[PDB]
Amino acid sequence: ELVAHIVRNYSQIDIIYDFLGFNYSEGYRSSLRRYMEYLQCKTAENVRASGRLVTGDKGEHNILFDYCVSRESLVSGDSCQGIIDFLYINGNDVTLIIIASDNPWLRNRQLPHRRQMEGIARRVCFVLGIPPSEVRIRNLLLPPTYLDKGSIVRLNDIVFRLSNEQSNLLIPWLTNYNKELDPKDVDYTALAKTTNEEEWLTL
Amino acid sequence: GMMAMHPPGKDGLLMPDRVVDNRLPDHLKRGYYDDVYWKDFFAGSDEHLNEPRMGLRGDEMRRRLEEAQTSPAPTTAKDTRRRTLEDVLKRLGKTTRD
Amino acid sequence: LVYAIRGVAGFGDYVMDVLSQLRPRGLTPDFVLFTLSFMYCALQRDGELALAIFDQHFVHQNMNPTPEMVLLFIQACSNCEEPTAVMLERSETLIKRLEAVGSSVDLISPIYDQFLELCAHLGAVASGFSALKRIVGFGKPLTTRMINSLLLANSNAISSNGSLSMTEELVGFFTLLKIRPNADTEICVNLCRDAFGESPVVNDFIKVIGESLQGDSEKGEAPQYDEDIPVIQVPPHELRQLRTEWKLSPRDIVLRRFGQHTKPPGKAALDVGSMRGSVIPFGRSPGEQL
Amino acid sequence: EKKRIEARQMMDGRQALKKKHLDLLREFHERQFFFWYERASERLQNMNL
Amino acid sequence: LAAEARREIHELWLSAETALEREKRVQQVAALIEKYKLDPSTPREADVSRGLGDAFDRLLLLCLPLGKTDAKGTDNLERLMHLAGRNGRELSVRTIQHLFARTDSFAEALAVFYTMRRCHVAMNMEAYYSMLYSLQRLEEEGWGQHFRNEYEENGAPSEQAMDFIVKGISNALLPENKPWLGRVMFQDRNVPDR
Amino acid sequence: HPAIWLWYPWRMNPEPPTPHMPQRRALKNVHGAVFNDLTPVQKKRQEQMLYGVNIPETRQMKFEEQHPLLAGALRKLEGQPKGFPFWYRKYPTRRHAYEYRFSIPVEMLDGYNDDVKKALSKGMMSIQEKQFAQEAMYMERYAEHDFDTTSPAVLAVKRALKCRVLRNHLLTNPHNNIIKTVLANTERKLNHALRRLRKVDFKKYWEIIRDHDVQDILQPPNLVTYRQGSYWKYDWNAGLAISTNLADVMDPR
Amino acid sequence: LLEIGNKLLRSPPSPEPLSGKASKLYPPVRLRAEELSAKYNVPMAYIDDSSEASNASKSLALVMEDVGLEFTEDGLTVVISALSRQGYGTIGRAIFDFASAMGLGPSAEMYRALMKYASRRGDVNESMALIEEMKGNGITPRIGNWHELMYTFYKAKDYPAVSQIVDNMKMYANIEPNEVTFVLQLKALAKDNSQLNSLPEAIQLFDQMENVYGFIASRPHYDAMMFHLSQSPRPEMRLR
Amino acid sequence: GHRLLHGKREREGSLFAVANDVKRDERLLRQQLNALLEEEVPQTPLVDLPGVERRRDLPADPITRLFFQHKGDHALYYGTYDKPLYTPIYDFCHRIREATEQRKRFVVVPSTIETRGCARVMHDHGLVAGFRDFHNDRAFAVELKYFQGDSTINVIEPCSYDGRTEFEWSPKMMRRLLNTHGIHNRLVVYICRTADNRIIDHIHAVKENIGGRGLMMVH
């Protein structure tokens, strides 16, 4: 009876389950993608999806791109800096959502360089036609095995440009989601702070 | 250094001699000590003193989800569609000519 | 055995079985044998056999490929029928590995020409255009055959990418690089025209190349054409063996012929100190002042 | 087990740094070849005399 | 005549800075070349090229952006590069960067690269790497233009277009995924292609 | 048109070069640690393997500093044909060019006579040049990357070539005691390299053994020690006990 | 200086060219300024573009010249130290930030001048935060900065921390102690009570300074040693 | 496809830049390469303080943490002193003795785990003035301590007196070392590495009722 009530009322119970870190088999990247595309469709109202790319119907740019899975993309013992998981284009802004890895020696490879960010912004200008004068790009590092309330709030504020009040109006379970970062992993916390406290890279 | 040897305080490093719970013997922590430290528990704002903090904190979310579930969905699965071979060809960008 | 059947068809399964049976016999395949197998694959223009051989025998060897081996593999994968994108991926991997490792011979131009032909057959216009940067880095001049392959790739890459802009960018090479056109060039540019449309620059180039081909036919007797790259069919005994000679003798080395000397240790091993008492930490007299 | 996996990850990071420094060494050695070519090319011109 | 040619090259450079037709600038540079006899067959005497100095590189870069398809507009550059190779002058990093900044198309970049290869022009590793970076940036710009056209004609970005946005060019000699290449070659002078 | 109103030259005294002096000194330190700070044998090997390590940034060697006349001469013909080498990508080290003398690439001999080509052909190569050609062929066969000279297979083949050279020398000069001792040391080193190569990469070891017909190159010397398992205890003592990847070559069930 | 700092704190200037005359807060008395500074290796504080920041910098330079200090890094260090000694930590930090934004490099001496305010008051957390900020700004903490940290702990009455900082400075920082360092260590050992061997440690350290380091004791050394020795009733120490 | 990384040099990914030589020193080359990889666009450089690669490796002491900076990979190859048949502890004791018999101020000794632990123990007991380049992973300088002419260190002897025999000390042995010759001995210091890779003295060993492998004695 309780499981039936849960599945009947909480439509995103699996997403909450994966975000809290209970899913040990396939992580939480699929649930993150479902959450992001849900927010994108609720915002655009004319969202069209085709495989791993979700695009709005022109107007304001609303693009979500599932590049690859960084866990399998990253190969130990090799030299290749910059592997993003999700790419979100909202308006003239580009955000590179990257899920951290459990290996502290791979995060530095995972985070793309300033030159890489500039090149990606230039490619966005080339393809979408967004003028180079107003183009911003930035990174977003997410915890490896879960997704805490602070990270979710920052994701909503930066990527989808949603304030806390309207985010809670859209999502009922968000205000009761009270997961915090693991106190043990200080390397990731410092990296996330120094990555999320930087300004947008222009042009 | 003693600041490094002893555990830190609230705003950073603190000398162990600056804590009353450290420099005051336990046998003398009754009476005047309680009078001094009563305000640390029983003094503050009216909301801080009267608001019950042991109540339900998810009732709003639960009622929102209940009313959302009771509310129906106007759009359902496209069971009324023809689902024909021509429809499949149009889905694949094909037709009879192709 | 592999070299004997080079001009015979329907023996890819025999080659695969021979390679599989090499292991139980105490033998291991080498670069010469892989070169012979890829020579057979290129001669038979099967491609699938070469792909399977590379996938299930060579990658386990972890040896440095040779330019002849890479060229034969790419020739087979290009001249085969119904090539696949995995063939392009394998060719790119082999080219990258060959560049990473060293080489003395120079087959860079034919290797990249066959790679561009493979990209033409597959429709990989982006890969064909990007190989131009590698060619420039090597400093090799471009070839009319390479440009014809690029034009064919543009013609048969209607789905992926390519358009009149690509056709114009490719066709601006013959004038700028002073490269003689060809009958294959005319055929490829007409195919690209029919695939995409009619740009005035393309039409003018078609007219001028037709006039030039007519003039060349008047000068000679037959129209010029892009000659195919010859396939190596040399016997295995002259396949550039990468080993000079080791005339060593383990029996002489063990029996110490010629009188080797090892300079054995002296009193260090023999001495053990006084054993009047037991060995205690810090010795019998820890510390001494003189 | 945690200590062992940390050691393995450290070894992998060392390999990555080795690749980076090998790229740096390749770039350094390409430049030194340019000095050799310029010195060698002039000398061979004299041999043509 | 060297000083006269120098000031004439300065006036031609200011004219080219002013809005002028590409064919007009081709005609002007060709006329200057023919009037000053900047020919490989000119003997040591009356060789204005050896005394041009800065005028030499200015005239070298004056003709490239107007290449188009004119045979004269290509062979003037070929003659200038032959003169540079015969005089042994090495092209500086700044000269190479300025020459390739005026380049507009990948075909023109290939043409100038192969022309200077034919003429055996001297330069250093930093200039060579700058040329390679400019070439790969030009290819990137061409692919970006193609994807912009296809996106505007299709109404939505394609999966291939977004994959290109994330990755970059297919092949590269100084790829962005390893931002530690060129440190030895470049003396902390990153090429700002515009 | 901005104008500066305050300035203190003596207080400033700024000397940051636009070409970064820290980068200059880092490059100098790298060059010194690669070539200048080596033993004579290591310097000889580095010069033999690499192209221009002995040339400094100033492009003037110490010998050229001390003997300007013996280092260079005057030539009227200018280096007009010699421009930038557009084929430098395929010749990173000397081992990629062992066809001509002094490891000169073929492209560099274009506007030169067939007499100069014959003078720089293979027949005129010295003994050192021919030995380097052999070891460069082996390095090309068993190399991991362009600048790979310390692979286990490369070390094995180099030790074997050194043993062959020493034995050939002793064939004509059987009264060289120092060469006998050097040969013994080289044979021991070759044995160690071959055992390590056999344990870490069996494919290349077996290929080398089959190609060069030294099947019993790794054999136990004495039965007395062999029957006590001291020949196989070497693998355990050398940290090579468990390295086979049993799944690839057999069934571990 | 106080009124200039108050103006710079309450209403910081703007890096706009034609704002100096528009702004009444800092009344006055093409080519990009940043591009000119980058090309000619000159600080932005020496550029006159009739800007609000330019007017503020000119007023600060005039005030410092009236006091007797040149508008340079040393003069800024002196003025910030003088402010910090007499409190005004926020004003000193505002002046430091204004100098950093105007291009006069925030040197380790300027950071020490900032640290003087925390050292006088004894704010250990503030001094450690200043050390960490200096490290994060790519600036090596120098011997003066370590001296200020030691003085901060001494004024905060954590005397063994001074010796710990000395040991870490010798081991990790690799900074040879000077006479000021020895005086600070002697004071810390004189007032230290965590271990019973403070007096023997001070005596041995004094002997080490006299013999091994080759320094000659001055009035601070002698006063510190006599103050330490005048604490024990032993006749040997009185004779010393 | 698997390449076995045999040896600590291959596990640590030595470049082996020197031709045909694997036992050549490489720390200077790696340090210069890291310096090149450093960035001179806001580009804050890195201070000269000894650093650690992981933020979790920072010392727990708040004062000591001020002397360490979190550097990603430039923290490796730290130090200026280079490496100066016998055990490292034997060599360390020999160097210390032969320099304190020559009245030198600093002695360069190889920096191993046991060597730096013994140095720290001697510093705690007051037999050494200080250290230089202590974070170096190859060698570090011990600053000798002198008082009224004669050296503080009188006799320093390794446990392996012949340099080839090791000894395991039981808690009974540690307590006997404490009460050697019928007296309580905090004067002569015996240093032993425990089973937990922890270097302590006999006082702490008997306090926590453990033993270990002895290294050296000094008084």
DSSP A8-58: HH-TTHHHHHHHTT---SS-SHHHHHHHHHHHHHHHHSS-EEETTEEE--S
Closest CA to C70 of C43, C19, C35: C35
Selected for mutation to probe chain H from F21, F28, F30 (highest H CB count within 10 Å) is: F30
Closest CA to G167 of G181, G183, G187: G181
- SS3 letters across E112-176: HHHHHHHHCCECCHHHHHHHHHHHHHHHHHHHHHHHHHHHHHHCCCCHHHHHHHHHCCCCCCCCC
F133, F125 contact by CB (below 8 A): yes
Closest CA to D13 of H75, E180, A116, H35: H75
| Cα H113 to Cα F75, H55, H77, H137, H140, distances in angstroms | 63, 21, 16, 9, 12
Which chain H positions have a beta carbon within 8 Å of B3's beta carbon? 62-63
Q: How many residues would you count in chain H?
A: 219
Long-range contacts of G186-189 (CB under 8 A, 24+ apart): G186/G221, G186/G224, G186/G225, G186/G228, G187/G154, G187/G162, G187/G224, G188/G150, G188/G154, G188/G159, G188/G160, G188/G162, G188/G163, G189/G159, G189/G163, G189/G228
Residue in A closest to H53 by C-alpha: A105
Written as one letter, the residue type at G188 is: A
| Alpha-carbon gap, residue G31 to G29, rounded angstroms | 22
Three-class secondary structure of residue F153 per DSSP: helix
Closest CA to G205 of G233, G235, G228: G228
Most distant CA pair in chain B, distance: 100
Query: Between vectors from CA A62 to CA A59 and to CA A63, what angle results, nearest 5°?
Result: 130
Using left for φ > 0, alpha for ψ between -120 and 50, and beta otherwise, residue B66 falls in alpha
Which token pair is C12?
Answer: 């890819």
Q: Do F211 and C244 touch (CB under 8 A)?
A: no
Classify the C-alpha dihedral C18-C21-C23-C27 as positive or negative: negative
The continuous run of DSSP H or E covering F118 comes out as helix F114-119
Residue H105 C-beta-side C-alpha neighbours within 13 Å: 8
- Tell me which residue in E120, E184, E188 faces F83 most closely, judged by beta carbons: E120
Q: What is the resolution of this structure in A?
A: 3.6
E104, E22 contact by CB (below 8 A): no
Find the DSSP H helices in G122-229. 124-136, 143-155, 160-168, 179-191, 198-211, 219-229
| Alpha-carbon gap, residue E122 to E85, rounded angstroms | 7
The two beta strands, H139-144 and H106-110, are antiparallel
| Alpha-carbon gap, residue C213 to G141, rounded angstroms | 78
D12, A105 contact by CB (below 8 A): yes
| Alpha-carbon gap, residue E161 to A128, rounded angstroms | 10
Count of CB atoms situated within 10 Å of the CB of F73: 10
Q: How determined?
A: cryo-EM
Q: Do H70 and A104 touch (CB under 8 A)?
A: no
D35, F59 contact by CB (below 8 A): yes
Closest CA to D27 of E189, F50, E182: E182
**Residue E110 phi, psi dihedral angles, 5° rounding:** -60, -40
Residue G179 C-beta-side C-alpha neighbours within 13 Å: 10
| Alpha-carbon gap, residue C156 to C163, rounded angstroms | 11
Closest CA to F88 of E173, G80, C226: E173
Query: What's the DSSP call for residue A90?
Result: E
DSSP E16-51: HHSS--HHHHHHHHHHHHHHHT--TT--STT-HHHH
DSSP C149-189: HHHHHHHT-TTTS--HHHHHHHHHHHHHHT----HHHHHHH
| Cα F205 to Cα B76, F133, F215, F243, distances in angstroms | 68, 21, 11, 15
| Alpha-carbon gap, residue F190 to F194, rounded angstroms | 6
Tell me the sheet residues that pair with H51. Answer: H69
Using left for φ > 0, alpha for ψ between -120 and 50, and beta otherwise, residue F216 falls in alpha
DSSP C64-129: PPPHHHHHHHHHHHHHSSS--HHHHHHHHHHHHHHHHS--SS--HHHHHHHHHHHHHHHT-HHHHH
CA dihedral C249, C253, C256, C257 (to 10 degrees): 20
Q: Is E46 on the interface with D (CB under 8 A)?
A: no
Q: Do G128 and B2 touch (CB under 8 A)?
A: no
Contact partners, residue B43, CB within 8 Å, separation at least 6? none
G28 to chain H, closest Cα gap in Å: 31
Selected for mutation to probe chain E from D27, D39, D41 (highest E CB count within 10 Å) is: D27
Query: Between vectors from CA E35 to CA E34 and to CA E37, what angle results, nearest 5°?
Result: 60
The continuous run of DSSP H or E covering F137 comes out as helix F127-141
Contact partners, residue A197, CB within 8 Å, separation at least 6? none
| Alpha-carbon gap, residue E132 to E100, rounded angstroms | 10
Q: How many residues would you count in chain B?
A: 98
C35, C72 contact by CB (below 8 A): yes
Classify the C-alpha dihedral E72-E78-E82-E88 as positive or negative: positive
**Residue C58 phi, psi dihedral angles, 5° rounding:** -75, -45
Q: Do H145 and G149 touch (CB under 8 A)?
A: no
Q: Do F3 and G48 touch (CB under 8 A)?
A: yes
| Alpha-carbon gap, residue E184 to F27, rounded angstroms | 8
| Alpha-carbon gap, residue F145 to D20, rounded angstroms | 14
| Alpha-carbon gap, residue G143 to G109, rounded angstroms | 10
E72 to chain H, closest Cα gap in Å: 44
H165 to chain C, closest Cα gap in Å: 9
CA distance from start to end of chain C: 83
| Alpha-carbon gap, residue A41 to A36, rounded angstroms | 9
Which token pair is C202?
Answer: 């393309």
CA distance from start to end of chain B: 85
Which chain A positions have a beta carbon within 8 Å of B57's beta carbon? 176
The continuous run of DSSP H or E covering H109 comes out as strand H106-110
Which token pair is A159?
Answer: 């990527």
CA distance from start to end of chain D: 72
| Alpha-carbon gap, residue A159 to A95, rounded angstroms | 7
| Alpha-carbon gap, residue A170 to B50, rounded angstroms | 32
B3, B19 contact by CB (below 8 A): no
Burial of C21 (0-12, 13-18, 19+ CB in 10 A): exposed
Count of CB atoms situated within 10 Å of the CB of A16: 18
Which token pair is B65?
Answer: 């989800």
How big is the D-H interface in CB pairs under 8 Å? 27
D32, H44 contact by CB (below 8 A): no
The continuous run of DSSP H or E covering A62 comes out as strand A62-66
Find the DSSP H helices in F4-73. 9-12, 21-31, 40-49, 62-66, 68-71
Count of CB atoms situated within 10 Å of the CB of A122: 21
**Residue A54 phi, psi dihedral angles, 5° rounding:** -120, 125
| Alpha-carbon gap, residue H142 to H120, rounded angstroms | 10
Contact partners, residue E69, CB within 8 Å, separation at least 6? C172, C175, C176
Closest CA to E130 of E169, E166, E99, E176: E99
Tell me the sheet residues that pair with G66. Answer: none
The continuous run of DSSP H or E covering F223 comes out as helix F223-226
| Alpha-carbon gap, residue F83 to E85, rounded angstroms | 7
Which token pair is E124?
Answer: 């250093």
Instruction: Enumerate neighbours of F (3 or more CB pairs within 8 A).
Output: C, D, E, G, H
The continuous run of DSSP H or E covering H142 comes out as strand H139-144
Among all chains, which residue has been given the structure tokens 């002569």?
H188
* Touching, B vs E (3+ Cβ pairs under 8 A): no
Q: How many residues would you count in chain A?
A: 203
Query: Between vectors from CA C36 to CA C35 and to CA C38, what angle results, nearest 5°?
Result: 65
- Rounded to a whole number of angstroms, the CA Rg of chain B reads 34
The two beta strands, H69-70 and G47-48, are unpaired
Which token pair is D29?
Answer: 């050695």
B2, B15 contact by CB (below 8 A): yes
The continuous run of DSSP H or E covering H191 comes out as strand H189-193
Long-range contacts of C228-235 (CB under 8 A, 24+ apart): C229/C75, C229/C110, C229/C113, C229/C114, C231/C39, C231/C42, C231/C43, C231/C72, C231/C75, C232/C39, C232/C68, C232/C71, C232/C72, C233/C6, C233/C39, C233/C43, C235/C3
| Alpha-carbon gap, residue G137 to H187, rounded angstroms | 47
With both helix axes pointing from N to C terminus, report the angle between E125-154 and E93-101 in degrees, rounded to the nearest 10: 20
C177, C170 contact by CB (below 8 A): no
Which token pair is C68?
Answer: 């002849």
The two beta strands, A86-90 and A93-99, are antiparallel
* Touching, A vs B (3+ Cβ pairs under 8 A): yes
Q: Do G158 and B15 touch (CB under 8 A)?
A: yes
| Alpha-carbon gap, residue E6 to E51, rounded angstroms | 9
How big is the F-H interface in CB pairs under 8 Å? 61
| Cα C156 to Cα C150, C201, G112, distances in angstroms | 10, 20, 71
Contact partners, residue C70, CB within 8 Å, separation at least 6? C94, C95, C98, C107, C111
A92, A134 contact by CB (below 8 A): yes
Which token pair is C228?
Answer: 């195919």
Count of CB atoms situated within 10 Å of the CB of B79: 6
- Tell me which residue in G36, G45, G74 faces F2 most closely, judged by beta carbons: G36
| Alpha-carbon gap, residue F47 to F63, rounded angstroms | 15
Tell me the sheet residues that pair with A201. Answer: A137
Count of CB atoms situated within 10 Å of the CB of F54: 17
**Residue F14 phi, psi dihedral angles, 5° rounding:** -85, 130
Q: How many residues would you count in chain C?
A: 290
Burial of H54 (0-12, 13-18, 19+ CB in 10 A): middle
Residue F154 C-beta-side C-alpha neighbours within 13 Å: 25
Contact partners, residue A160, CB within 8 Å, separation at least 6? A39, A40, A43, A90
Contact partners, residue D14, CB within 8 Å, separation at least 6? H11, H12, H13
Count of CB atoms situated within 10 Å of the CB of C64: 22
The continuous run of DSSP H or E covering H158 comes out as strand H156-158
| Alpha-carbon gap, residue D46 to D43, rounded angstroms | 5
Among all chains, which residue has been given the structure tokens 């409190």?
G87
Closest CA to E121 of F52, F111, F79, D40: F79
Q: Do A172 and B61 touch (CB under 8 A)?
A: yes
C103, C67 contact by CB (below 8 A): yes
F88 to chain E, closest Cα gap in Å: 10
G37, G26 contact by CB (below 8 A): no
